[PDB]
């Protein structure tokens, strides 16, 4: 003669959602590998990175000689047009972060010294890159030095 429970809640999860949240999430967490970053969200987060960069530099101690830059697309595009172009991006939050030297190139060139080759090998570029970065991991004042 006795009757059991019905429970309205679970009916919300079945009907309003095509997935079932009262299922053990640890099965997918431990076995199935995750999913990467998608579209229509990276543009906002990069523009969030655009804003925190343009406010980092108005705070951090800027060398005002010649370093024209555009912070567009998440990279400050640190460049003096004679010798230097690099893309530096904060790895984390605004205030206390070091930097990274995401791209490196040199604007100095000659057309007849080398044999039609880039006079510099990329191994020095990396050799500079970590030398910047180990001293960026030495956490000095970033802009003046």
């Amino acid at each position: 003669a006795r009757l059991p429970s019905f429970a309205i809640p679970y009916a919300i999860d079945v009907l309003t959602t095509g997935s079932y949240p009262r299922l053990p999430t640890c099965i997918r967490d431990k076995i199935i590998p995750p999913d990467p970053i998608t579209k229509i969200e990276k543009q906002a987060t990069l523009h969030q990175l655009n804003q925190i960069l343009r406010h980092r530099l108005v705070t951090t101690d800027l060398p005002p000689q010649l370093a024209n830059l555009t912070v567009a697309n998440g990279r400050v595009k640190f460049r003096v047009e004679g010798e230097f172009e690099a893309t530096l991006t904060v790895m984390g939050d605004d205030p206390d972060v070091p930097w990274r030297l995401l791209k490196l190139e040199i604007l100095v060139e000659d057309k007849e010294t080398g044999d039609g080759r880039a006079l510099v090998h990329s191994m020095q570029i990396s050799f500079i890159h970590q030398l910047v970065q180990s001293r960026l991991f030495a956490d000095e004042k970033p802009l003046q030095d």
Binding site: T113, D115, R117
Partner: peptide, 25 residues
């Protein structure tokens, strides 16, 4: 189922740079 065959003087004066700017930790 290479070299420009001028790397020798490039590296030589780069060697002069290593005894003036050494790598720094």
């Amino acid at each position: 189922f290479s070299s420009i065959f001028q790397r020798q003087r490039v590296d030589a004066l780069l060697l002069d740079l290593r005894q003036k700017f050494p790598p720094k930790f």
